[PDB]
Amino acid sequence: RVDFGRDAALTMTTDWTAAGVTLMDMIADLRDGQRLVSDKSMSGTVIRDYVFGGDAWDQFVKVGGKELWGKDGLMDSTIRGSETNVTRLWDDVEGVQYMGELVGANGAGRMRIWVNTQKYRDQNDQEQFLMKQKAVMGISSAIEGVRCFGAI
Amino acid sequence: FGGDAWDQFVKVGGKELWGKDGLMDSTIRGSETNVTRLWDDVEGVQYMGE
Amino acid sequence: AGLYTTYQLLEVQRKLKTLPAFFLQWFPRQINFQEDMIAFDKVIQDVTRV
Amino acid sequence: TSLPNYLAGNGDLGSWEPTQIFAGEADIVTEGGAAGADIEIYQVIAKNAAGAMVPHDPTATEVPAPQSVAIGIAAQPAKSGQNVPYYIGGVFNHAALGWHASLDTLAKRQAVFDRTNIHIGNLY
C-alpha cells in the first residue's frame, strides 16, 4: 500500500439517507469539507470542482429536488441572490458529464458539479466503477500532481 | 458579522429574505438588495453584499 | 539501493500563514509623540431652542 | 531527531555484498500463486493440500506430506493472503537460496531438485 500521506480527517462519512436532511445541510456538509481542505492545504486553494458519483447524484437529487427548483429556490429568476444553472434533465452516458454550476451572485462560493460513471475492467476481469458511486469527491487543480516514471 | 451572528441571522430570516415579497424580489420595485445566497467558507473577511 | 537509496529532491512545499489587516483601514492617522499622555477636548453646543 | 552531535566518534556507512543467483544458461520459468505463510526472498517453497505456497520443509506427516516436495524458488517476499512470484526454471546458486536446517550439504540440496527444470549448481 503506497500511502501518499493524506490526513485521515478528510476521509469523511456522513449520511444522506436520514430524515430531516435538506438541501442546505448537504451543501453545508460539502462546505465543511471545503473548510477542512482550506486549513490543511499548502496553497489554501478553495476547491471549485466536485466530482460526484452516480448513486450520490441520485441521492442528492432525491433529497434536494423539492427544495432546489422550488418556491424561491436557488434557480429562481425572481431572486437576486444566486446564478445557479443546474440542469433539470440530463442524459445518461457511461462517462463524465458537466452537470452545472452552483455559484452565488458575484462569482462567490461557486461549485462545479461533475458526475463520473466510467467503468474500467478489473484485474480479475470484472466491471468496476472508476469513480466510487456512493461518494462525493472534491478536487482542485492545486494538488500539483506528478507523473512518476521509474527505470525500464 | 461574526460567524455565529451571520449564521443565526440566516437561520432565522433566510426564508423571509430571498423569498416571495421580500427585500430580494425582482418584481417588486421597492429595494435594490444583493445579499448573496451562497458563500464559500474560508477563514478571512468576505463581502456578502448590500 | 545498495548501501542506501538514491533520492531525487523536488521543490520544497511552503505555507506561510499571515494575518491580513482588516481593522486598520479605519485608523489612517499616526502620532509619534514623546510626551507621556495625549489629551482630547470635546465640546457639545446645543443651539436648537425656541 | 532534533539535536545535533558534538562529540568525536566514528561510525559505519554500511558494507555492501553482492548476491549472484544464476549458475547456468537454462530457460527461466516464473509463475505467481497465492502464498500460504511467511516467505522471504529466495526461500525454497512447496504447495500444500489447498494450493497455497508453504515454505519448504521435509520430514512432514506415517505419510509424507505434500509440503515435502519442493517446487519453486520465490522472488519477492510476502505474507499469507498475498501472492508470491516464484521461479520454476533455470540453474541457481547453491548458497544464495534460503534453505533450512537438516538440508545442509551439496548432495541433499541437489537431491531436492534432481528431476525438475530447476537445477542447482556451485559457483566457481
List of chain A residues whose C-beta atoms are within 8 Å of the C-beta of residue B18: 72, 79, 81
Shortest CA distance from C15: residue in chain A = A42
- Which of D:9-38 have CB within 8 Å of C? 13-16
Q: Cβ contact (<8 Å) for C15 and A146?
A: no
Q: Which CATH number belongs to the domain containing residue D39 in this structure?
A: 2.40.300.10
Domain spanning A1-146: which superfamily?
capsid protein of prophage domain (3.30.1930.10)
Consecutive H or E run containing D84 = strand D83-87
User: Across the strands, what pairs with D54?
Assistant: D46
Residues of B in contact with C22 (CB under 8 A): 45
Q: How far apart are CA D118 and CA D21, in angstroms?
A: 12
Residue D49 in domain: yes
Experimental method: cryo-EM
In a domain, D15, yes or no: no
CB of C20 less than 8 A from some CB of D: no
Chain-centroid distance of CA A8 in Å reads: 19
Q: Domain limits of chain A? A: 1-146
d(CA A18, CA B3): 27
Domain-embedded: residue D7: no
Q: Phi then psi for D43, rounded to 5 degrees? A: -90, 145
- The answer to whether D55 and D37 are in contact (CB under 8 A) is yes
Separation of alpha carbons D37 and D111, rounded Å? 24
Q: Which helix (H) or strand (E) holds D73?
A: strand D70-74
Structural domain tally of chain D? 1
Instruction: Give the domain extent around D67.
Output: 29-121
Phi and psi of A129, rounded to 5°? -75, 130
Is D46 a domain residue?
Answer: yes
Burial (CB < 10 A; 0-12, 13-18, 19+), residue A103, is buried
The three-class DSSP label of residue D87 is: strand
Position D26, amino acid:
A
The Cα D95–Cα D121 span in angstroms is 9
Across chain A, where does the E strand assignment appear? 49-52, 96-101, 112-116, 119-121, 127-129, 137-138
Residues 6+ apart with CB under 8 A from D82: D34, D35
Question: Do C and D have ≥3 inter-chain CB pairs under 8 A?
Answer: yes
Within a domain: D4: no
Task: List the grid coordinates of D48.
Answer: 500444500
Q: How far apart are CA B41 and CA A44, in angstroms?
A: 12
Nearest CA in chain C to A45: C15
Residue D34: inside a domain, yes or no? Answer: yes
Chains A and C contact (Cβ–Cβ under 8 Å for 3 or more pairs)? yes
CA distance A26 to D103: 66
Q: Please return the burial class of D45, using the count of CB atoms within 10 Å of its CB with bins 0-12, 13-18 and 19+.
A: buried
Nominal resolution in Å?
Answer: 3.8
3-class SS at A97?
A: strand
User: Residue type for A47, please?
Assistant: I
Look up residue D23 and give its three cell numbers.
Answer: 549458475
What dihedral angle (degrees, nearest 10) is formed by the CA atoms of A107, A111, A115, A120? 110
Q: In what order do the strands lie in the sheet with D44-47?
A: D30-34, D83-87, D70-74, D44-47, D53-55
Q: Are A24 and A70 in contact (CB under 8 A)?
A: no
| Chains A–C, number of C-beta pairs less than 8 Å apart | 6
With beta carbons less than 8 A apart as the criterion, state whether B48 and B14 touch: no
